[PDB]
């Protein structure tokens, strides 16, 4: 999920 913010 981090990839969608980072």
């Amino acid at each position, epitope marked *: 999920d*981090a990839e*969608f*913010r980072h």
Partner: antibody
Framework: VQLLESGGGLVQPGGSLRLSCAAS????????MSWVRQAPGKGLEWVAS????????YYSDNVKGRFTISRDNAKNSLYLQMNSLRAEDTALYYC????????????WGQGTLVTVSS | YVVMTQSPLSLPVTPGEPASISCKSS???????????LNWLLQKPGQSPQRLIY???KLDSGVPDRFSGSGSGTDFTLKISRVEAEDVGVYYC?????????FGQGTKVEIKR
């Protein structure tokens, strides 16, 4: 919100397969999406992600260079092109929506089963 | 890279009684933006996963408030105040702070009827 996967089946080791996921009930082009897989009787493993913007993508170490995630916003569809399949790729593949409003993946599809075998 | 460890892996519980599942990460899930991206889902028998909780303690749509989540940093807990038959299945925590996404091993809740 509905996510409906298809395309799973039996493939020879080293072969290729294309999975599709048809989305409805939301504005598809506004959401990031991912594929997550579950080997029979086992846990959950993230496979690949694609942003709502720019076709930016991300892959797990195990599938780098073999799988390609894409989307067709016109057709409300997410795809996974799987090449050079290995026995260890055998699993139920789920289409999963990322909810930017809650900061977390939310809806999962029903999954499509990929079996890699001779 | 961030390892999520759940305990216990099997959880038999008598209906009406509370249950608790631990989820510990190998490093802090506090993001630089101030938020803590720790989530819980449930996979009921024969069904696809469904989210129960996000941002540690926030209940998703339609989830009853007998479920609660707490914790900070590396140590998290899902509690069910009173377990019901419909709560049977496999519970997973996962983190959204660090790339790549990682899930716990899953805790299977059994109802002791």
């Amino acid at each position: 919100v509905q996510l409906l996967e298809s395309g799973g089946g039996l493939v020879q080791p080293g072969g290729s397969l294309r999975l599709s996921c048809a989305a409805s009930g939301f504005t598809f082009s506004n959401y990031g999406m991912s594929w997550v897989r579950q080997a029979p009787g086992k846990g959950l493993e993230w496979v690949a992600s694609i942003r709502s913007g720019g076709g930016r993508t991300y892959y797990s170490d195990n599938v780098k260079g073999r799988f390609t995630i894409s989307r067709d916003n016109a057709k409300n569809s997410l795809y996974l092109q799987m090449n050079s399949l290995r026995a260890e790729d055998t699993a139920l593949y789920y289409c999963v929506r990322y909810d930017h409003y809650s900061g977390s993946s939310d809806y999962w599809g029903q999954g499509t089963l990929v079996t890699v075998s001779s | 890279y961030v390892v999520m460890t759940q305990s216990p892996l099997s959880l038999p519980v008598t209906p009406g009684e509370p249950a608790s599942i631990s989820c510990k990460s190998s490093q802090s899930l506090l993001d630089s933006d101030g938020k803590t991206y720790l989530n819980w889902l449930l996979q009921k028998p024969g069904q696809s996963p469904q989210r129960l909780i996000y941002l540690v303690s926030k209940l998703d749509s339609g989830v009853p408030d007998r479920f609660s989540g707490s914790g900070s940093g590396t140590d998290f807990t899902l509690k069910i105040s009173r377990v019901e038959a419909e709560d049977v299945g496999v519970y997973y925590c996962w983190q959204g702070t660090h790339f790549p996404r990682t899930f716990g091993q899953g805790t299977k809740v059994e109802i002791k009827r």
